[PDB]
């Protein structure tokens, strides 16, 4: 569903410059080495992105290629954003994510269970903190659904 992911990332980045957006999108669709390089560029904050835009893009990139190490700024952010969740609540979310299977499943899970922002964000934290615990379909689906949610507020 990486095609839909790319589309949502493009929309998420609509307000940045072309070359810049083009540089990011071209890299993330350019293979593992290209995406890795783009993630390093992102975390070093050389591009003129807002803090939230940079962390969002690093999450997208690590979700695509989990060999990319975690950026503390993004990691810490997801921790704070979900700090009010009981461990039991997160346990339920892990199971439900897995059972969701793919993008359509994950989107449906978020909507039909009327998830709060913190619950959505716990799904994103699961894929960012523990990408290897989830299939590519779940990682991409979760991040796509998350980006779709944000873009609908634009
Ligand atoms: Mg965490
Ligand atoms: Mg958490």
Q: How far is it, in rounded angstroms, from Cα 72 to Cα 58?
A: 11
For residue 53, give the nearest of 19, 6, 5, 21 by alpha carbon. 21
With H, G, I as helix, E, B as strand and everything else as coil, classify residue 132: helix
Contacts of 102 (CB under 8 A, 6+ apart): 1, 137, 138, 141
Q: How many CB atoms lie within 10 A of CB 137?
A: 16
Number of domains present in the structure of the chain = 1
- Taking the centre of ligand 1 as the mean of its atom positions, its distance from the CA of residue 71, in whole angstroms, is 11
Task: Please name the residue ranges forming H helices in the chain.
Answer: 2-12, 18-28, 32-43, 51-64, 72-81, 87-100, 103-112, 117-129, 136-151
Instruction: Provide the residue range defining the domain that includes 107.
Output: 1-154
- Taking the centre of ligand 2 as the mean of its atom positions, its distance from the CA of residue 130, in whole angstroms, is 11
What was the resolution (in A) of this experimentally determined structure? 1.5
- Taking a 5 Å cut-off on Cβ, the residues next to ion ligand 2 are 82, 122, 125
Ligand nearest to the CA of 81: 2
Read off the DSSP letter of residue 71: P
Ligand nearest to the CA of 85: 2
- Taking the centre of ligand 1 as the mean of its atom positions, its distance from the CA of residue 79, in whole angstroms, is 5
Q: Using the structure block, give the residue that is written with the tokens 């979760």.
A: 142
Q: How many CB atoms lie within 10 A of CB 130?
A: 12
For residue 120, give the nearest of 151, 142, 98 by alpha carbon. 142
Q: How far is it, in rounded angstroms, from Cα 154 to Cα 151?
A: 5
Ligand nearest to the CA of 128: 1
Q: Using the structure block, give the residue that is written with the tokens 């994510």.
A: 97
Read off the DSSP letter of residue 154: -
For residue 141, give both structure tokens: 């689906």
**Distance of alpha carbon 35 from the chain centroid:** 14
Ligand nearest to the CA of 90: 2
């Amino acid at each position: 569903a990486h095609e839909i992911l790319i589309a949502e990332t493009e929309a998420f980045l609509k307000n940045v410059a072309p070359e810049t957006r083009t540089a990011i999108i071209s890299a993330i669709t350019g293979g593992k080495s290209a995406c890795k390089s783009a993630a390093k560029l992102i975390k070093n904050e050389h591009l003129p992105l807002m803090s939230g835009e940079a962390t969002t893009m690093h999450i997208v990139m690590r979700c695509l290629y989990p060999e990319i190490k975690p950026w503390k700024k993004a990691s810490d952010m997801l921790n704070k954003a979900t700090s009010s969740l009981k461990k039991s609540e997160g346990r339920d979310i892990r199971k439900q994510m897995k059972a969701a299977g793919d993008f359509l499943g994950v989107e449906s899970m978020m909507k039909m269970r009327a998830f709060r922002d913190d619950q959505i964000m716990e799904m994103v934290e699961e894929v960012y903190d523990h990408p290897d615990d989830y299939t590519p379909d779940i990682r991409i689906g979760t991040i796509t659904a998350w980006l779709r949610c944000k873009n609908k507020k634009s």
